[PDB]
Amino acid sequence: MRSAQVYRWQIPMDLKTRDGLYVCLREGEREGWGEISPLPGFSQETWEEAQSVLLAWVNNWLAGDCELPQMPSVAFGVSCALAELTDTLPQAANYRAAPLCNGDEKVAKVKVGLYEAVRDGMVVNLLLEAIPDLHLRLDANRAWTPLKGQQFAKYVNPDYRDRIAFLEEPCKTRDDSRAFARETGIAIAWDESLREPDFAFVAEEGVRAVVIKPTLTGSLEKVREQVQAAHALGLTAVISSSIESSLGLTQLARIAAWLTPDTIPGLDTLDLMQAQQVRRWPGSTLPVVEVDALERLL
Numbered sequence: 001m002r003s004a005q006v007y008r009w010q011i012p013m014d015l016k017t018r019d020g021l022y023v024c025l026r027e028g029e030r031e032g033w034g035e036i037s038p039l040p041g042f043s044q045e046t047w048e049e050a051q052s053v054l055l056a057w058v059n060n061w062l063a064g065d066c067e068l069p070q071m072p073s074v075a076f077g078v079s080c081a082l083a084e085l086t087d088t089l090p091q092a093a094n095y096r097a098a099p100l101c102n103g104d105e106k107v108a109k110v111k112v113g114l115y116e117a118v119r120d121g122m123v124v125n126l127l128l129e130a131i132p133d134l135h136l137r138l139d140a141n142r143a144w145t146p147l148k149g150q151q152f153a154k155y156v157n158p159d160y161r162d163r164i165a166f167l168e169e170p171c172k173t174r175d176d177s178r179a180f181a182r183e184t185g186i187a188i189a190w191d192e193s194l195r196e197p198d199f200a201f202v203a204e205e206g207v208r209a210v211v212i213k214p215t216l217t218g219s220l221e222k223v224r225e226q227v228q229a230a231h232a233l234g235l236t237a238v239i240s241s242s243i244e245s246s247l248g249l250t251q252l253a254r255i256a257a258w259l260t261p262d263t264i265p266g267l268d269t270l271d272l273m274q275a276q277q278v279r280r281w282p283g284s285t286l287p288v289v290e291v292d293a294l295e296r297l298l
């Protein structure tokens with residue numbers, strides 16, 4: 001027989017707090033968990049709206065309904081609980097993420113688009129020059145105009161460009177991002193794009209990878225179809241963090257081990273937070289908050 005729990009929480013950060021929810025579904029002796037934590041500025045839905053939809057969905061599932069949610073964060077969180085219940089989300093994971101860097105398969109991540117383009121190009125060249133066997137993933141989050149893209153590349157030695165594993169969504173438009181890629185020889189990745197209507201997995205010169213943030217994307221099943229479509233075209237697919245708590249981050253670790261076995265995931269966001277909850281990320285020294293101490297809604 002079906003039973004469940006719903007929690008709400010707010011974790012302090014080093015975003016002042018990270019606000020989200022959890023769902024626990026049980027069937028008999030089985031149990032599955034999931035995290036529903038929309039990200040302000042990326043997810044369309046709010047924490048409050050996700051809370052309403054998740055409570056309704058839970059009520060209905062408790063009542064026997066089979067309908068799955070459409071709201072992305074809820075769809076994700078619920079799909080994980082259900083996969084756990086059915087034992088389809090493997091337990092194994094390496095729990096290793098590409099480290100998030102500033103300045104200093106060796107793979108690391110650097111966010112760009114915060115400082116001006118030249119500074120980012122200079123910072124990037126310095127690193128690459130400094131660590132000859134380093135491979136960098138760069139995240140622009142559509143920060144640049146074509147000009148800015150040229151400005152960034154100008155400071156990056158062509159002979160180190162092959163070591164930029166991908167630069168996500170450099171430009172405001174896909175055509176401009178594609179043009180930047182072709183001209184600079186710097187590989188790019190799609191991230192936000194995959195979430196736009198009408199997106200199609202197609203071979204494109206200069207595109208080498210996609211970044212999938214499941215909390216933004218939707219169900220695990222949808223994440224799996226996108227990973228697979230990326231793989232079928234020969235692209236790298238990276239499972240990436242939406243600043244989930246430790247619970248969802250660990251799940252993301254398992255999803256990566258399972259669906260993107262040879263690709264280290266972009267989960268280096270735990271240290272931005274003050275505590276872990278429910279499930280530990282191995283090696284973290286953050287305190288852990290137990291179920292018992294969370295705000296229960298259902």
